[PDB]
Amino acid sequence: EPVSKLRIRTPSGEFLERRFLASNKLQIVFDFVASKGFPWDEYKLLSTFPRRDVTQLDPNKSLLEVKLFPQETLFLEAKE
C-alpha cells in the first residue's frame, strides 16, 4: 500500500520523478538516480527543512523509516 513519490532535481534544473513502494530500501533509490547519470560517488541526494544528506543514510532502511513518505523533493548535487 504505502507509496512515496519523490521529485528529484538535477543540477541542470530538470526534475526526475518516481514513485516507490515506501517499504523499499533507500538503496533502490540510489540505484534509480544512478540509472540516470548521477551515481552515488559523484552525487549526493539532499533533502531540506531539515537539511540531510540522504545518500549518507542507512541504505538498508526503508523510505518509510527515514520518513521519505509520502512526498519529498530532493536535490542532486555534485560531491566535491
Binding site: 521529485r7 531540506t48 512526498q71 523533493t73 530532493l74
Partner: protein, 170 residues
Amino acid sequence: PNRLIVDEAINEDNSVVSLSQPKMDELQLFRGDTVLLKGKKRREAVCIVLSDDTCSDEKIRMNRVVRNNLRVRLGDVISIQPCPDVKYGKRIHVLPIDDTVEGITGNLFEVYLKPYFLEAYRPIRKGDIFLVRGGMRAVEFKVVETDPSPYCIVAPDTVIHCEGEPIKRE
C-alpha cells in the same frame, strides 16, 4: 490562485510556508514545491510549501519575515499558487540593512550568507528582506537583484554578491 488566512509559523524558517496536507492535496501542492505568494500592495514572495499537522485547511502558516515581505499581518489574506518554473540562480545581489549591521564586524558572506544558503535551495525574490542568524547576531539583508529575475533558487553555483554599502531603512 487560492486565498488563505495568514497564521503564525510552526516552522520558523524564512523560506517555509505550511499548509494542512488535506489543503495541499486539494491545491495539488507537492511537499518542497516552490509557490508564489501574493499579499498587499502588489508584494510577492517565493517560498517552499510543507505539510502541517494543524486541522484548519483555511489558513497558511508563515513567519514574520515572509509576512513582512508580503506586507501582511496575522489574520490577513494572501493568495498562494504553484510556481513550478523557478530556476537555479546565476547570480544574486544582496546588501545588509544599516541598523542591523552597526556593531557587526565579521565577514558577512562567511558568517551569515554562506551558511544560510548552503545546500538549502532557498527561493528568493528581488526586494525580499531576510533575517540571518550568525553568531550572537541577527542581520537583515535585502535582495537588490537576482538573475534570473525577479526570482530564483540559490543553488550551489549561484554567485553570491554582497559588495557595497548597507542599504538605509527605506
